[PDB]
Amino acid sequence: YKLDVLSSVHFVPKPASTSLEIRVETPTISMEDAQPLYMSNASSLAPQEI
Amino acid sequence: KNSKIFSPFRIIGNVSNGVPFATGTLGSTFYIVTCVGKTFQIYDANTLHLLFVSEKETPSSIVALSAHFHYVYAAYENKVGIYKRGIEEHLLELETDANVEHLCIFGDYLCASTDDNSIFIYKKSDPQDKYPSEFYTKLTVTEIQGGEIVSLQHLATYLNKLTVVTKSNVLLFNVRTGKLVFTSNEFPDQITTAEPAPVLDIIALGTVTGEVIMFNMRKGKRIRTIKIPQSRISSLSFRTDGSSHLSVGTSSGDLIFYDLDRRSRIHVLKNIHRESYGGVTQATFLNGQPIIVTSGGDNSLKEYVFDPSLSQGSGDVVVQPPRYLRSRGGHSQPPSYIAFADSQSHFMLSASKDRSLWSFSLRKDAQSQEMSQRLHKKQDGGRVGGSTIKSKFPEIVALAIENARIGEWENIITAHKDEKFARTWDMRNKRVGRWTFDTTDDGFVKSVAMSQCGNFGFIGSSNGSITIYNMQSGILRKKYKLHKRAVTGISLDGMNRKMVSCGLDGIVGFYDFNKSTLLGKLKLDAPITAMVYHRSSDLFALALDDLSIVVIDAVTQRVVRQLWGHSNRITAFDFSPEGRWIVSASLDSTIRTWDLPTGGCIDGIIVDNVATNVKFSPNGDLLATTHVTGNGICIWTNRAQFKTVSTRTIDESEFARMALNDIDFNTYTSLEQIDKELLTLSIGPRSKMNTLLHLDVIRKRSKPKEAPKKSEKLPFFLQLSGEKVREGIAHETPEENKFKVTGRLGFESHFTKQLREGSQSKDYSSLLATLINFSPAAVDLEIRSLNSFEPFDEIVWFIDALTQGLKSNKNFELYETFMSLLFKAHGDVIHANNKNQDIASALQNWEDVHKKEDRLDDLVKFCMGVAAFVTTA
């Protein structure tokens, strides 16, 4: 972090790496921020994934 | 005389009208009170910064001003007002028709002298009262006693004596007893000024023939006599800084300084103020300081300072001459032209008959400055031709300003009286520019205009030729020759494509500035006197000779509106920033506001003095006008900026004697429902449907990720124990028997009463009204709380209520939402007992209505299919 800030963020990106992420089925509204509106009401997992 | 759109705000550019100013001290600091027509202003002596102005204008012009600590006394007609911080605290009304002339305040006694040689004395009701209010007595000086009163003075260390100074001689009255203590010996010359000296028992008297007398009141004899032959004393003042100096101001505009100890003249300041406006009307040394404040009738207030001597010894002999320290000023004669310098209402440019161009600030007076007339050295290298004696440029008839290239090169053009060229100025430097634009046809300049880009300047000559110069290099580029008489107006649109001109021959020329072609020519009935072009709307108005304003559209070159009603020449007019109003001033002393959309006069004013100029602020908040009398600029506030104005035409006959509501206020409110057969949504936020359907999921998102920590020992009824308001469904009280599940009579909810009432009355209109008003949480709670047990009366009634609502075709989106919540909460109940006749019949009737509202789907599908096809292929 310090070296990046010092170099004004002109660094060279770190080598690409792969990781595994777990996605839990949930209503799409829950993922959004908290206010009196929602963007999408679909589910977070596609029919193939179910 | 009262406008419904505009109200006076203040007067800009005025510092003093010539009435002697008053100096008051608050602690160590000093302040000066100056008179401005029917109002006064207070300046800080250290900075000459405006502090206060009188809250309201007096009925008559102020004749005298005296200030003591916080309180200021202003005399006008037969009344003396007492002001603190510019706000009137008490008004003293004298009982005689004679007007007040002079005003003196010492101790608790207020002395006012009227023009009939009557002196009124007022006294404080209480010794600790701030100002005198009670009327004590009246002393009148008769012709045998003395001449006309010249001034009222009080000498220090005199108990209850008022030193009345008359043209003939001086008189000493005892105000407490009202008796003449002493009469001075008659003086040969008329006394004009009096000033108490810093020495005891001595008052300095100035005569009409340049004599200053140090009269000793105790001894009743002359002590000294200074002679100033062929001069008239107007002011006197002593220096209190330990140097025995005396300053004598004269009506010729000169201020002489004498050294009383040495019997010598220190210096003379020549022509500090104009003789034609009264010379030096007031000159006062600041108490205990080397600073002297001077004023005159030329609308100027100056300060001079005596520097310390340059000699290490004999400093009293080697006296540095007084040095100018600071000053404030304005025009000496009424402004001839005004304009707004910037998009904001910060600065204004004003030109006057006194041959000076000023930049006045609305935001702060100290920022006001005079634009310099120092000339730039010629680029060629030849000597510029002019008289060695420097004189100001002639009066400015027209002015044009742009800000697209401010700071890059010249951005102002001005036309002068009886001059065959136009001068340029620079707003950033505040100095005359280096270019001069000539008509090149031996004619005087009558019109000046600038392009919005700031690259071109257009000059209209009295011989009918329009020359076009470049502002950066001052090189003539193009010359148009269509008019044969004087060109009284030139304008170019924002796009710099179409140019318009007007002249005294009555024709309006339309040119293509890009291609230099004549697009068309329009002839009007009468000669055209002025033009104003509105760049946003491409409309321009022409003040014709027949007392009309003709509005023309440049795009189509046709007259769109014509305005009638002025009874004399139209001096000036302007467009409102939104392009919707025209305010015009005429020589018949009326300012009329015209509404272009309807083309009628909506407002009218009657001004005491004819308004020569009218200008809107580009913001639209202020209207500036200048009048034939007065050195300032009148600023008005646009009340249309804080409330709507009716556009009903003003009464013409009524206005002469002094000398559909939605359409009137330019608004329209949409109907609740255009037609009964038409589906109409609810009048409210469109998110209400989505919130009601998805209330739970929205709320689970709302909950914090971690449970708040709470005290174990917590009141169980804390929410109810609230000292008293909350209007939630929870905070409902019953309104006034066998047990009933839904609610026992006397203990049932408001909603259940209306539902039962509607079922009997066969009308749920009352219930539907309260459903729409219910908050989303309340609505879900009521539907969930409906009775779900046999005979299922409440569910049947609720379905009947919703079915009636769908018949109305109003608020249908909500009735659909309520039905969806009914299925969500009681769908299993309906499914289990679907065969029940009561539920089935209610459901069937709902379906019959609901089946009709499918036409909305057909419309929605068609529009997308075509809209997608139209936009794509």
Next chain:
Amino acid sequence: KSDFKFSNLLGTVYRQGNITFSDDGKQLLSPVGNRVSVFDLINNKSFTFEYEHRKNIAAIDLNKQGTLLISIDEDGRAILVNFKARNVLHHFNFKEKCSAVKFSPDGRLFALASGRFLQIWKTPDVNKDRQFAPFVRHRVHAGHFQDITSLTWSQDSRFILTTSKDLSAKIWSVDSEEKNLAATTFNGHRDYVMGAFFSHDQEKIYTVSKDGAVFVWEFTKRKYSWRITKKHFFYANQAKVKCVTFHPATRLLAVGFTSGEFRLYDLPDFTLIQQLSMGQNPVNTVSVNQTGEWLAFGSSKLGQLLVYEWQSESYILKQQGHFDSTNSLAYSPDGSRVVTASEDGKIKVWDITSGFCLATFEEHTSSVTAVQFAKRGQVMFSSSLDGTVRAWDLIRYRNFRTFTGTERIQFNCLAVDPSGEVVCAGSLDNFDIHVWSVQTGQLLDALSGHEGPVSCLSFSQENSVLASASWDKTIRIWSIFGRSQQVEPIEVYSDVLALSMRPDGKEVAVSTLKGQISIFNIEDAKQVGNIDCRKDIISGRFNQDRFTAKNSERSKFFTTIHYSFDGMAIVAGGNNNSICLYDVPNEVLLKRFIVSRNMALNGTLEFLNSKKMTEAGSLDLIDDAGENSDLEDRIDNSLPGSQRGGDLSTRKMRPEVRVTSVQFSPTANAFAAASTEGLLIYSTNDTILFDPFDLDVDVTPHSTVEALREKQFLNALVMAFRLNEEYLINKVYEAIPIKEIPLVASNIPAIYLPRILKFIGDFAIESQHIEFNLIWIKALLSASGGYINEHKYLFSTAMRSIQRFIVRVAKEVVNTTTDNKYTYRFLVSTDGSM
């Protein structure tokens, strides 16, 4: 046309000061830097006032009537504002650092905490006309020995409690006759008294101190005097009280600590109701609704705003904004929503009407440089300096794919195929353009030919060519699709900084380092126009600069440009204080907009006050952190040379006014500009301007109404358009019966067709007449469907607005209708038993 006005500020919900609820409780007033933003939570609408302080706002208040708003900056400069008219009544300079201002509950008086003095003034009448000195002083009180931290009014407007840094709280009487009733000083606090309040009965006075002690004061026998009957302590380990508020009716005490956690207490019992944490940053301000149900907290460091419904333990509002971070913006294809990319690495989707962030994405590790939608709009793409390009699916908010170069290149610019099948990114260190396949995620190829870093990219919507520019002083048009690969380089006089593609796809404009906007014909590859912009640009002198703004060449160019969808205008911005709107065909400046008037920003002023300059240098450049009382404020974490990419504490230099991105609204005559303070949105919505079209003497508002009375609806409608008055068009529009709509629609002149379609799109979105508006659209499309097709780019924004109404509101209604129909059939038809 070019009549744009500042409408609202997105991207920031709170910067500093105190947030106030409206008296009704239905609106929240939040200071956002130099301006005040008002959010209506129930109606889901927001607006930002146009007026502007010269420094950041410090204290605000709205009177109980809701008619007058007073806002004060950090110098004491105050502005009185008519809340209903949204206009400024007066400007007042109190010549000191006013910590708090509060209207009396009557509304007649308001009090000021200016240093060690309490100033009581008389409220100007809102109905009265503006005058030179509207305010009238009532009294000045000088009893405190140090600065007043806060003040509180009694419910009856008769007493004022003031708390100062003197470790003391003091009470004053508004009426001189009642001075003996309340002339007491409350001592005994170890630290600054943060707040002092009355009980509902007004017989108990509570005082709170920074150290974390609450004292209960009562008038009791030891003959009677105020005494501390009880003392309560917040046993916060090291957190200090930062703000306090009390609601007498509900006896609720909300205290915000410097650790970032707030507690709700019930007085006088001192029962802990709840304890939550909004983060690690101090809670700077706390406010209570009038009913006592909603509590609003704000944290200045991250610009968080939080409304908490403590009863149900729910969040009405929970938002966080950006300052000095927004690198890019993108409109949704329907124009409803706007997306932003920030140096934090977070992508946020903001609702234009509401003013709140709908969603946040935090996958990127480093600064996100660009964002762009596909032509469809469902999908979004973003590039970042961490070396990745990520695709986002807005239906499910998943990062369904991530593209990365083989050799670890930072990406600064991005472009997406209109078919949404190819994605291209450029860099400032590689000189090549990477191309990926969206379906596969594989790197298709690396376009080469530039001799300098690629500054910008753009696909054309129709012909589908790729236009790239570089600091190589050249522009290259790539025909990537097709059997043959062709490149057409065009030379330019100077380095190209920005590039915009015409909606037609036939021309491309580029902003150069010389301050020029040059337009080229893609097919012929020849210049067709040029606009000179160096003189238009306003660049200010920085406090640290040793050279004038005129001679400064720091930013006399535009780093971002965008076209209008009609194709006739360009909006440009850069690292300067001006947003310039040009007209392409005539090559003229339509209008220029000043980005900021905040002296807290560095590039605002062209000339700096010579009083600040001294023999040492500018007084502004002197660092006064050591004066600050808290250790956190004094600490200096600045890296010696950093310019961007870190938190504000790292820079050590003042923020500089700049615009990072600009775009036109696809569905309205508005544009949005990402700047340091936030997303400025300029719109023409107000339309107070009188802009008639083709008037004659016979056309008048009265004649229009007469035509309706005579049932000449077509003539009435056309005459309304010629006047171009919205109220008249609306009046005529709703007076046309349904039977005669198709007759009128077929006969409307082609000249006024774009105007009616624009009116419907704006009117329909918020109107209740869903069926009436759909009938009109059906008649207009059916009658003039062919004409709209022949001129796609003249009708583009009007058409997009109509589709938004048909899809965002009309569909949602029928969708709720149709499921009820199926839910109905299942319940009746199926068998429910057992």
Next chain:
Amino acid sequence: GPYHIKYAKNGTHLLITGRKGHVASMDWRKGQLRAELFLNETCHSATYLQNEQYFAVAQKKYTFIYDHEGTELHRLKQHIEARHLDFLPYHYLLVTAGETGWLKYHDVSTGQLVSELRTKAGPTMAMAQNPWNAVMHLGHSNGTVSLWSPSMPEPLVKLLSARGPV
């Protein structure tokens, strides 16, 4: 401004330190300026060392020793946020106290931290030396005055002389 002033022990030289960081050393009787620093920083107090030749300034975070002409000689990294400065003339010790609640004695002759004492009473509100015995008196926010010597880790005496900060 504001300006904190310190005179030399013999009264011949005057040291003024402005809060915004204007520090000047002068012979006020002869009107001669020995040094003038325009440190763009927050300066709290300054003091002369054994004579007018050297003086110390307590800046934003560190104390600096300067020369007669104003050349910086040392940056006292060990003294952090000192708000009060004192010099014991016969012992050649420089004494500092500030927001850290730490009393530090520094030998100017050798340049070695003689002792650092933990006051345990928060920021130091006031400080004064007893010229008779060179015992330092510190006032604290709790209203107590404590007497200190470099050779004792705990205060010699504690006096309760106020109900608030001293």
Next chain:
RNA sequence: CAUUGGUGAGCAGCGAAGGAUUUGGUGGAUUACUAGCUAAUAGCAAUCUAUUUCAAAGAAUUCAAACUUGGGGGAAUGCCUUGUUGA
């Protein structure tokens, strides 16, 4: 032959009781104008201080208090912590 190299001698043209270049000092602006001091619901502004004191209130086991240190290795004697011995 060219100097857009320097230094000079002179014209044409410009041209009203002279013209050009440089420079010290002060004043007004450089943010949007509600006045000075104090012990401040009022006094003072020529100050009182010969009523300026009393009374009342006011003291957290927080009895906690370096969020403040360039890296590696140690620290005899110090300092901190823990235990322990004898009073």
